[PDB]
Amino acid sequence: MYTFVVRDENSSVYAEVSRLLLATGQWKRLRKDNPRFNLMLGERNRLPFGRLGHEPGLVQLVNYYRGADKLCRKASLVKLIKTSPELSESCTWFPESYVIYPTDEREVFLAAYNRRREGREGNVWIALISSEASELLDFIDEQGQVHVIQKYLEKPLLLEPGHRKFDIRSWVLVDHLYNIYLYREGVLRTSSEPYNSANFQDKTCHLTNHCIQKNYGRYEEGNEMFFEEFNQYLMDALNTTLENSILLQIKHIIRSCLMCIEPAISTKHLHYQSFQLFGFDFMVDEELKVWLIEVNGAPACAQKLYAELCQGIVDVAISSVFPLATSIFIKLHHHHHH
Amino acid sequence: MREIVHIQAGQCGNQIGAKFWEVISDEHGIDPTGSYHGDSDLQLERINVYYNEATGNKYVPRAILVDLEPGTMDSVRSGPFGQIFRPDNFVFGQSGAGNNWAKGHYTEGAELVDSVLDVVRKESESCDCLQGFQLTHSLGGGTGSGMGTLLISKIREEYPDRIMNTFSVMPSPKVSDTVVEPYNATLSVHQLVENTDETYCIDNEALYDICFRTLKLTTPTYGDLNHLVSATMSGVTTCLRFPGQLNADLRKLAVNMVPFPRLHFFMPGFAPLTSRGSQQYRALTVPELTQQMFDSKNMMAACDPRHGRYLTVAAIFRGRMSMKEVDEQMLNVQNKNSSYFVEWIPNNVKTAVCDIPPRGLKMSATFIGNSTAIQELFKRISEQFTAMFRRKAFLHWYTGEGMDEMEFTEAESNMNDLVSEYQQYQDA
Amino acid sequence: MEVIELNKCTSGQSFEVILKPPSDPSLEEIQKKLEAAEERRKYQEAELLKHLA
Amino acid sequence: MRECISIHVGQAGVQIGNACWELYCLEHGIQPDGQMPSDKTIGGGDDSFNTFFSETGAGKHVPRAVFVDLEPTVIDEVRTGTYRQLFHPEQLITGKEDAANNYARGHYTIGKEIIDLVLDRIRKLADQCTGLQGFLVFHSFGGGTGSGFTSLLMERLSVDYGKKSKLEFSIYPAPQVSTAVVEPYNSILTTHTTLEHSDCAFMVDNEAIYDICRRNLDIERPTYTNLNRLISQIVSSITASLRFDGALNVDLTEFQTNLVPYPRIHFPLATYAPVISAEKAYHEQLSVAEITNACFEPANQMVKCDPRHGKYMACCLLYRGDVVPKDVNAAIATIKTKRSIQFVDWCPTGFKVGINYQPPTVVPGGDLAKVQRAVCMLSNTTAIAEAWARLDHKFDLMYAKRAFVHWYVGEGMEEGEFSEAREDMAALEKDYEEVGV
Numbered sequence A: 001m002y003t004f005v006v007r008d009e010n011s012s013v014y015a016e017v018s019r020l021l022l023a024t025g026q027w028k029r030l031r032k033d034n035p036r037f038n039l040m041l042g043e044r045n046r047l048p049f050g051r052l053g054h055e056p057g058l059v060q061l062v063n064y065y066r067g068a069d070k071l072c073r074k075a076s077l078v079k080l081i082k083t084s085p086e087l088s089e090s091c092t093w094f095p096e097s098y099v100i101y102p103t104d105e106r107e108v109f110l111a112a113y114n115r116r117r118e119g120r121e122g123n124v125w126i127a128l129i130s131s132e133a134s135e136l137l138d139f140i141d142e143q144g145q146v147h148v149i150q151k152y153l154e155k156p157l158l159l160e161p162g163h164r165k166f167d168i169r170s171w172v173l174v175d176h177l178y179n180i181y182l183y184r185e186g187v188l189r190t191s192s193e194p195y196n197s198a199n200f201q202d203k204t205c206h207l208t209n210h211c212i213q214k215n216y217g218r219y220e221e222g223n224e225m226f227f228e229e230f231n232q233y234l235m236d237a238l239n240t241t242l243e244n245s246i247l248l249q250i251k252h253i254i255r256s257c258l259m260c261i262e263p264a265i266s267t268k269h270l271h272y273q274s275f276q277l278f279g280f281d282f283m284v285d286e287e288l289k290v291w292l293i294e295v296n297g298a299p300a301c302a303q304k305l306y307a308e309l310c311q312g313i314v315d316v317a318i319s320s321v322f323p324l325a326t327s328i329f330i331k332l333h334h335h336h337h338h
Numbered sequence B: 001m002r003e004i005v006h007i008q009a010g011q012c013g014n015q016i017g018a019k020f021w022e023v024i025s026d027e028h029g030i031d032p033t034g035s036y037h038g039d040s041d042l043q044l045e046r047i048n049v050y051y052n053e054a055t056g057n058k059y060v061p062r063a064i065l066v067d068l069e070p071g072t073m074d075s076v077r078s079g080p081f082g083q084i085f086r087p088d089n090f091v092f093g094q095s096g097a098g099n100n101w102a103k104g105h106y107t108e109g110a111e112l113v114d115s116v117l118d119v120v121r122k123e124s125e126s127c128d129c130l131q132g133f134q135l136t137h138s139l140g141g142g143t144g145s146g147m148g149t150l151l152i153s154k155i156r157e158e159y160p161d162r163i164m165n166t167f168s169v170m171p172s173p174k175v176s177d178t179v180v181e182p183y184n185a186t187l188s189v190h191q192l193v194e195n196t197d198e199t200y201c202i203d204n205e206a207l208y209d210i211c212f213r214t215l216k217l218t219t220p221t222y223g224d225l226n227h228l229v230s231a232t233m234s235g236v237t238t239c240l241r242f243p244g245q246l247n248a249d250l251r252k253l254a255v256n257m258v259p260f261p262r263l264h265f266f267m268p269g270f271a272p273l274t275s276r277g278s279q280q281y282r283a284l285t286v287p288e289l290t291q292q293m294f295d296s297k298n299m300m301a302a303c304d305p306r307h308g309r310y311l312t313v314a315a316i317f318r319g320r321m322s323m324k325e326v327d328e329q330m331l332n333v334q335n336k337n338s339s340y341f342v343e344w345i346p347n348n349v350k351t352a353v354c355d356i357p358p359r360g361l362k363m364s365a366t367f368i369g370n371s372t373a374i375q376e377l378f379k380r381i382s383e384q385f386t387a388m389f390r391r392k393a394f395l396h397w398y399t400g401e402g403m404d405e406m407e408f409t410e411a412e413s414n415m416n417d418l419v420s421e422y423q424q425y426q427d428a
Numbered sequence C: 001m002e003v004i005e006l007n008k009c010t011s012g013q014s015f016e017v018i019l020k021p022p023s024d025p026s027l028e029e030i031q032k033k034l035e036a037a038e039e040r041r042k043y044q045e046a047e048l049l050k051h052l053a
Numbered sequence D: 001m002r003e004c005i006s007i008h009v010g011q012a013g014v015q016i017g018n019a020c021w022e023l024y025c026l027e028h029g030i031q032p033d034g035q036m037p038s039d040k041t042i043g044g045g046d047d048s049f050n051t052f053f054s055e056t057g058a059g060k061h062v063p064r065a066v067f068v069d070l071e072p073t074v075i076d077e078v079r080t081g082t083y084r085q086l087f088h089p090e091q092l093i094t095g096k097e098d099a100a101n102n103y104a105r106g107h108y109t110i111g112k113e114i115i116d117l118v119l120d121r122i123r124k125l126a127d128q129c130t131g132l133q134g135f136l137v138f139h140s141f142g143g144g145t146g147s148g149f150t151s152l153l154m155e156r157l158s159v160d161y162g163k164k165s166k167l168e169f170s171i172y173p174a175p176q177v178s179t180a181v182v183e184p185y186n187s188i189l190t191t192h193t194t195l196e197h198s199d200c201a202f203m204v205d206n207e208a209i210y211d212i213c214r215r216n217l218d219i220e221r222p223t224y225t226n227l228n229r230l231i232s233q234i235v236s237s238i239t240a241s242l243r244f245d246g247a248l249n250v251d252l253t254e255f256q257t258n259l260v261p262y263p264r265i266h267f268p269l270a271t272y273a274p275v276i277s278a279e280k281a282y283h284e285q286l287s288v289a290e291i292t293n294a295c296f297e298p299a300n301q302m303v304k305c306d307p308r309h310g311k312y313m314a315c316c317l318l319y320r321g322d323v324v325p326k327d328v329n330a331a332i333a334t335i336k337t338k339r340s341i342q343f344v345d346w347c348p349t350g351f352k353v354g355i356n357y358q359p360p361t362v363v364p365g366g367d368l369a370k371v372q373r374a375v376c377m378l379s380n381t382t383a384i385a386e387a388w389a390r391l392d393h394k395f396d397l398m399y400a401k402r403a404f405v406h407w408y409v410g411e412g413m414e415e416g417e418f419s420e421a422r423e424d425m426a427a428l429e430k431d432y433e434e435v436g437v
């Protein structure tokens, strides 16, 4: 009998993990404050990592990587990308971004901005969206919190019928050994109202969340296109595949990001172990170049896929460490010699 | 020398007390004349905890034998180890107490108590650094319950800064048919809540059921019961009698076992359970000792440990075994059954290992638990008490010695408060 | 990067190496505290003997 | 030459004390007699070893040490053991009845009645000192005497020697060898009371040492003998600079200067390598690069924590054996590029380095193998606040129910000293977080 503790009630993903674990009949749930657990399904914020791995006769495992917040906050991601030699500063797959504090790299932002003016090229940025610098600087200074001025992609790949925007969500599981596992099913979160070049005020064709989309669901069920259909659209419409045109770039970006922080976050020679599920958010431009938008440290799955992914998390993340009485993941590894 | 002064009162007290001295004398290589004949210096390092040392290299138990009748103490004097005790430490009347707590506490026992205290004073003054006192007695009779608690109260007055320890035998209708035992027990428990630091609840119900069900003795005697009491008594005092790390004295035991002053009633356990003679040829493994010592069927208090939570636990293993394996097995018990150990006292189980096993065994384990399940024992007494007391049944035997009903109401109250106090911490 | 403050001797040597640059109670009070504790302790003991009386 | 007085309080302090002077005597060539053949100035001197050892006309070398416990048993073993003739009887101070794992009993009840005798005996050592620099205090956090008496002593020593430095070697409680459930209470109490009076404190978590003994020395179930002989090595690496010719950490003031910018944040992390089983048949000798890289592994630290998720404010490397500066600097360069070593913005990212050519001495028939080179890293990092969090958590769990509190209140202490002690630690945890992110 193994033991666990649930410390985030809001997690749709780890509610399903605990449910699935209990169903096995070899995992008992304890109450949050009981320290004698094998597994912590931890809280979102202020997770007490200092208290893990100090219970004798218990191997302890947690569902977050301490320090992974550096990848999962927007201003930390820019700084991480900008200051790590393995990515920076000529990273081809992350939009030109600047960390901006309210009332810093604003002096450095305006410099590159004012060459896009005299260069006579498309000068739209995101924080939200505008082509004039005055609106954005004056917006954040007013707003409150720290923000990022990031280059907006004027030329996104558009789905037909409908001339619409989208973004790709890929779920990634990093186990206790730092094996990087990309789930084979991803999802496109679509706009359902045509993308407009000149019209930036109306921010529903431009911002492709699942919530802000509220016509809705004209083309696909809940504005969620999945990989079989999107592969078929790419074959029929563009004479290419998902794997070739998009999924290699996604694999490269995921593996680059996670190898960059491995020294800072790995639990290889530690007294407790970590795993974590990330959600990477990707944008695809009209040239089929993939761009990283952000990484989410506490993702939610899409309704269809919950059952499979959560069983995967149990199989490779939890049952690897705590064994009981066809693979949904692609393992991301590359060792090129030079 | 950190000296403990032992007192035994009444039939039960003197009978289990006599047997305690037999067992520990054999463990320390002391024979009936008080001469050392052992083959190990570990036996003598802390001998002064229980024995004074006279001239001729003689060891005398620091033991005071008290009773209001002469029968049980003539039986002890005439017994095999009887010649070991100091003769002036036998203090006894002729009247008896008639299984009446009022007679023991207020009338018959009052007449004799100052001559007991004179012997206690003499033994105490002779101590370089006295730890305190341990009393053996039953709570169901008259002398041990009534006079025994009177003694506790007087000793506390003279020695307010010493530890008071009891082995209190609880009455069961499976062993005794005296109708007024719940009265004597409830009055005595009222005293124990106020004036003791540590009480071992040796429950006759548990001792009987162990002997009948587990040991397969269809007609148990007191001797069969007492054999389990002496094993337990040998076990729980091991840390006081040999070197030397965990719970090595009475105050250190109390600071580990007693998170709140009133909740100082302990539930002892033992493995392996044995009957006299009937031979343990097979030594237990470390995993079996650990499973058995925590088993309900091995508790000397008739309480279901799964019905409560452990506040604190002391586990003491005896014999030559793997310390690594003891540590694994102990951690295993608290990790597999973690919800029965209060989360709000971290690391509440402590473990000792002594290299010398008890007579006739290679491996033993002794459990001492402060569980909230002990409320079931007090609740059983309370129900037996209230049944009679709501009709004032048999109360004339007590009011005829000058007691008022109000004493009964107060004692009833304090014990019901104890019960609700245990339930308070069971639900935190 | 930069070694400084190098001292050598027969027993050993020491130095500093820089990779990057930057960017009580009185004796009385103790006794008032120890005596107040003793007085509280003695009050508790006196109350006990009051109750036992 | 400036003298240092070592004070050993409680069982842990005394027993760690024995292992230390044993090890010093071996390192310096002093016999259990007290006789040092290699010392040529008979009847006195001012060599570096005279910081720790005074001298008599008969050529005897006597530790500048006081052992104090409220209980004769363990100090009686010092009186009658191998090193009995090394110590003058007035250095070994014993009570009768101990503090029963109760801070309040050690501090208030039994502390009050013994404090003046201990100071008298410490005063007798300070009087035979030409220039006393201060004190090294050894004690547990968990015992009553170790927690309670030490904190009182430290308050007194401040009064009687305000200008003198005080260093601690403190044993942090671990359930695998603890003897009391109230050690978290005792630890927070003594930490609160001692915080102002200690210039630099080296915490050793018994959990870390116990695991190092299992993992690297292949010991099934470590005893205090196993733990202390390892502790004494770490202590010796730290005090070697005061007892031997050198220019790094030559006096007690430098420990503070080099390791403690913020006075309250005075708990440097000690990491030691290599730890190699004597019974190990064949062993590849580890390089300067390897032992220096082992200093950034949580598994080798005296307190298990993660310096990657904190900031350094100072970092000394103390080598013993066949080591030259060329190898140390090359090792640092490599290490820096592979590891996460953030300093605070207001300190230079850098390392103070000290090398002694004599390799570590081992106790004959011990568990530790002889090695060609060893290192103790002393780094002040915010990651050690993890140890306060763990301890503060256990305190909170018990204190919310007022469990065992009646034992302390019974000895004179007020329930409010608990919450004061606690909220001082709350502020300490908050100081470390302020510096660390």
Ligand SMILES: CC[C@H](C)[C@H](NC(=O)[C@H]1CCCCN1C)C(=O)N(CCCCC(C)C)[C@H](C[C@@H](O)c1nc(C(=O)N[C@@H](Cc2ccc(F)cc2)C[C@H](C)C(=O)O)cs1)C(C)C
Pocket (backbone or CB within 6 Å): B011, B012, B015, B173, B174, B175, B176, B177, B219, B220, B221, B222, B223, B224, B225
């Ligand atoms: C015919 C009555 C028998 C003797 C009694 N049964 C009952 O009381 C039943 C009957 C009806 C309802 C339920 N009750 C409990 C009974 O078996 N008793 C206790 C009552 C004795 C009270 C009176 C009659 C004297 C058992 C004890 C009884 O058998 C005795 N044991 C001993 C005894 O242990 N004697 C030893 C010495 C000794 C004497 C007195 C003591 F207090 C202790 C030890 C020596 C023997 C050889 C030994 O070691 O086994 C003496 S009497 C209990 C365990 C239930």
Ligand SMILES: Nc1nc2c(ncn2[C@@H]2O[C@H](COP(=O)(O)OP(=O)(O)OP(=O)(O)O)[C@@H](O)[C@H]2O)c(=O)[nH]1
Pocket (backbone or CB within 6 Å): D009, D010, D011, D012, D013, D015, D016, D069, D070, D071, D098, D099, D100, D101, D102, D106, D140, D141, D142, D143, D144, D145, D146, D147, D171, D172, D173, D174, D177, D178, D179, D183, D206, D224, D227, D228, D231
């Ligand atoms: N490393 C090490 N720890 C010890 C030693 N002795 C005790 N301890 C630890 O110290 C704590 C107990 O404190 P002790 O020093 O025994 O207690 P004390 O200071 O003698 O205080 P009292 O006995 O209460 O008067 C526990 O955490 C023990 O694990 C030792 O020799 N070495």
Ligand SMILES: Nc1ncnc2c1ncn2[C@@H]1O[C@H](COP(=O)(O)OP(=O)(O)CP(=O)(O)O)[C@@H](O)[C@H]1O
Pocket (backbone or CB within 6 Å): A095, A126, A150, A151, A152, A153, A165, A166, A167, A206, A207, A208, A209, A281, A283, A293, A294, A296
């Ligand atoms: N540089 C950019 N170019 C084009 N579109 C962008 C963009 N940055 C953000 N977006 C749009 O904004 C949407 C959400 O962006 P982002 O993920 O940064 O916000 P968010 O973090 O509040 C949503 P979530 O955390 O749930 O994924 C994306 O779906 C994308 O269409």
Ligand SMILES: Nc1nc2c(ncn2[C@@H]2O[C@H](COP(=O)(O)OP(=O)(O)O)[C@@H](O)[C@H]2O)c(=O)[nH]1
Pocket (backbone or CB within 6 Å): B009, B010, B011, B012, B013, B015, B016, B097, B098, B099, B100, B138, B139, B140, B141, B142, B143, B144, B145, B169, B170, B171, B172, B175, B176, B181, B204, B207, B222, B223, B225, B226, B229
């Ligand atoms: N276990 C055990 N119980 C006993 C013994 N003798 C008496 N009792 C119990 O003690 C109670 C009566 O107390 P007793 O000691 O005989 O009366 P006292 O002489 O007035 O103290 C009854 O519940 C008996 O069952 C004994 O030797 N062993």
Ligand SMILES: [Ca+2]
Pocket (backbone or CB within 6 Å): D039, D040, D041, D042, D043, D044, D045, D046, D047, D055
């Ligand atoms: Ca000299």
Ligand SMILES: [Mg+2]
Pocket (backbone or CB within 6 Å): B011, B141
């Ligand atoms: Mg009788």
Ligand SMILES: [Mg+2]
Pocket (backbone or CB within 6 Å): D010, D011, D071, D098, D143, D145
């Ligand atoms: Mg002690």
